[PDB]
């Protein structure tokens, strides 16, 4: 019964941006 | 002389002894200047952290840090990990000011970590502890912008660390910009950040 928020995702080792969708 | 030149040339086959030796100190004087350097940092951030569930990250260099993220580089920055005790979660902390994701370059976004640090083992997990979000401005009284929110166990953010840090957790939505920088935010040209980590209700001694 708590709250439900966001994670992330997980690091590469190519280029790309910081996301997790 | 040419045979025996080389005699008094011996004295010139001294030149690399002299020389190769100055080479073992510019080596040292470098890796104890890395260290020296170094530790600086370690004591500019033993300091700077805090003992009793709270965080007070102060960021500085403002417009030098925003465009950063803004004309990618330099991203994210992060607090200093701060602990409930001195034995206990590593809890460090990232800033998005420009913003990661669904908060990027139209939001500034800033989130809660938690680090692995060697009295995890022992501590309760996974984290499972109140964290309110704040923004601290310079001015007057200024609204705290921010919120906590109830740790989900099942977050992958959550869990008993087992690399060098965690997922971030927090919110890619935090302050709109275009309030943070209008407003008093920014005094100085420098801006706060307050951690809270309800530890209110918790198993004492």
Same mark, same amino acid.
């Given at each position: 019964?708590?709250?439900?928020?966001? !994670?992330?995702?997980?690091?590469?080792? !190519?280029?790309?941006? !910081?996301?997790?969708? | 002389?040419?045979?025996? +030149?080389?005699?008094?040339?011996?004295? *010139?086959?001294?030149?690399?002894?002299?020389?190769?030796?100055?080479?073992?100190?510019? $080596?040292?004087?470098?890796?104890? =200047?890395?260290?020296?350097? #170094?530790? =600086?940092?370690?004591?500019?951030? @033993?300091?700077? *952290?805090?003992?009793?569930?709270?965080?007070?990250?102060?960021?500085? #260099?403002?417009?030098?840090?925003?465009?950063? *993220?803004?004309?990618?580089?330099?991203?994210?920055?992060?607090?200093?990990?701060?602990?409930?005790?001195? &034995?206990?979660?590593?809890?460090?902390?990232?800033?998005?000011?420009?913003? #990661?994701?669904?908060?990027?370059?139209?939001? @500034?976004?800033? &989130? &809660?970590?938690?680090?692995?640090?060697?009295? =995890?083992? @022992? @501590?309760?997990?996974?984290?499972? $502890?109140?964290?309110?979000?704040?923004?601290?401005?310079?001015?007057?009284?200024?609204?705290?912008?921010?919120?906590?929110?109830?740790?989900?166990?099942?977050?992958?953010?959550?869990?008993?660390?087992?690399?060098?840090?965690?997922?971030?957790?927090?919110?890619?939505?935090?302050? *709109?910009?275009?309030?943070?920088?209008?407003?008093?935010?920014?005094? +100085? #040209?420098?801006? &706060?950040?307050?951690?809270?980590? =309800?530890?209110? +209700?918790?198993? +004492?001694?």
């Amino acid at each position: 019964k708590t709250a439900a928020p966001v !994670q992330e995702t997980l690091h590469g080792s !190519q280029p790309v941006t !910081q996301e997790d969708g | 002389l040419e045979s025996v +030149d080389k005699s008094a040339g011996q004295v *010139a086959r001294n030149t690399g002894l002299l020389e190769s030796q100055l080479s073992r100190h510019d $080596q040292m004087l470098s890796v104890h =200047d890395i260290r020296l350097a #170094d530790m =600086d940092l370690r004591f500019q951030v @033993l300091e700077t *952290a805090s003992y009793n569930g709270v965080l007070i990250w102060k960021i500085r #260099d403002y417009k030098r840090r925003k465009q950063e *993220a803004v004309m990618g580089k330099t991203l994210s920055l992060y607090s200093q990990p701060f602990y409930t005790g001195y &034995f206990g979660y590593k809890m460090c902390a990232r800033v998005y000011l420009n913003g #990661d994701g669904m908060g990027k370059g139209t939001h @500034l976004s800033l &989130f &809660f970590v938690i680090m692995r640090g060697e009295y =995890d083992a @022992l @501590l309760p997990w996974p984290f499972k $502890q109140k964290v309110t979000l704040m923004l601290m401005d310079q001015g007057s009284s200024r609204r705290h912008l921010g919120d906590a929110f109830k740790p989900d166990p099942n977050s992958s953010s959550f869990k008993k660390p087992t690399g060098e840090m965690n997922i971030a957790s927090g919110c890619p939505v935090f302050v *709109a910009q275009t309030v943070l920088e209008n407003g008093t935010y920014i005094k +100085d #040209d420098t801006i &706060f950040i307050k951690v809270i980590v =309800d530890t209110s +209700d918790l198993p +004492d001694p």
